[PDB]
């Protein structure tokens, strides 16, 4: 089973200039809980944005060019990325925009955080047909002293 996890600002913005400009610790804690002990697939730009291996997860990087770091697994196509994960229950795809586009048709579940923030960005989450997806979990949180915007965690499953 393939799942995508992402955090979206208004208008589905996910990034600007290879970064995420907001800071929502509760969302990063949600990301860690839902990815720990699973393989994570990311594109090369996202790998450079994170800047280090994510501990406790098998890190698989898509790139057309040879890898430059043996602390992670480098693959050259979508099918190779999936194969490198082996026989696990759930594969997590953690972006970015181009990678989300390619795995969306293959995904059974979406873990989405909707952030109430207006962000100029240059990268968007793919348009997804709403009729294809059932919301199975949602949890709204107001802003607090640690998280400066309100946010909604949502899990959707392909119907
Ligand atoms: N808000 C969120 O949840 C979230 C999550 C993740 C990322 N982001 C943001 O997303 C942005 C990065 O997204 P992006 O769309 O620019 O890049 P990306 O999807 O992270 O990476 C694209 C690169 O991945 C490689 N790639 C993708 N598909 C491939 C394939 N089928 N075969 C071989 N290589 C492949 C290519 O690397 P080569 O050029 O080396 O071939 C491609 O240039 C940043 O702003 C980041 O902060 C946000
Ligand atoms: N829901 C969600 N929110 C995000 O911000 C997000 N970001 C990415 C890409 N960027 C990043 C950047 C940093 C870390 C990171 O350092 N995570 C630590 C959290 C501990 C901490 O620094 O607070 C981790 O161990 O997972 C992960 C993804 C991919 N999917 C996401 N999904
Ligand atoms: Mn092939
Ligand atoms: Mn197998
Ligand atoms: Mn806000």
Swiss-Prot record:
Keywords of the record: Antibiotic resistance, Methotrexate resistance, NADP, One-carbon metabolism, Oxidoreductase, Trimethoprim resistance
Annotated source species: Escherichia coli (strain K12)
SUPFAM superfamilies: Dihydrofolate reductase-like
Domain DHFR, first and last residues per copy: 1-158
Function: Key enzyme in folate metabolism. Catalyzes an essential reaction for de novo glycine and purine synthesis, and for DNA precursor synthesis.
GO biological process terms held by the UniProt record: 10-formyltetrahydrofolate biosynthetic process; dihydrofolate metabolic process; folic acid biosynthetic process; folic acid metabolic process; one-carbon metabolic process; response to antibiotic; response to methotrexate; response to xenobiotic stimulus
Pfam families (alphabetical): DHFR_1
Listed GO CC annotations: cytosol
Gene, per the UniProt record: folA
Impact reported for residue 20 to L: Increases catalytic rate 2.5-fold. Increases catalytic rate about 7-fold
Effect of residue 16 to F/S: Increases catalytic rate about 2-fold
Record note on what altering residue 85 to A does: Decreases catalytic rate by one third. Increases catalytic rate about 7-fold
Catalytic activity: (6S)-5,6,7,8-tetrahydrofolate + NADP(+) = 7,8-dihydrofolate + NADPH + H(+)
Outcome following mutation: residue 30 to G: In strain: 1810
Annotated protein name in UniProt: Dihydrofolate reductase
């Amino acid at each position: 089973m393939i799942s995508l996890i992402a955090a979206l600002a208004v208008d589905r913005v996910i990034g600007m200039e290879n970064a995420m400009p907001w800071n929502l610790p509760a969302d990063l804690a949600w990301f860690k809980r839902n990815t720990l002990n699973k393989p994570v697939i990311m594109g090369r730009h996202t790998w450079e944005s994170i800047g280090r291996p994510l501990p406790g997860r098998k890190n698989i990087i898509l790139s057309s060019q040879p890898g430059t770091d043996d602390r992670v697994t480098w693959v050259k196509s979508v099918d190779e990325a999936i194969a490198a994960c082996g026989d696990v229950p759930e594969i997590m795809v953690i972006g970015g925009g181009r990678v989300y586009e390619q795995f969306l048709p293959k995904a059974q579940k979406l873990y989405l955080t909707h952030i109430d923030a207006e962000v100029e960005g240059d990268t968007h989450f793919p348009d997804y047909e709403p009729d294809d997806w059932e919301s199975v979990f949602s949890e709204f949180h107001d802003a607090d002293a640690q998280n400066s915007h309100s946010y909604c965690f949502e899990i959707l499953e392909r119907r």
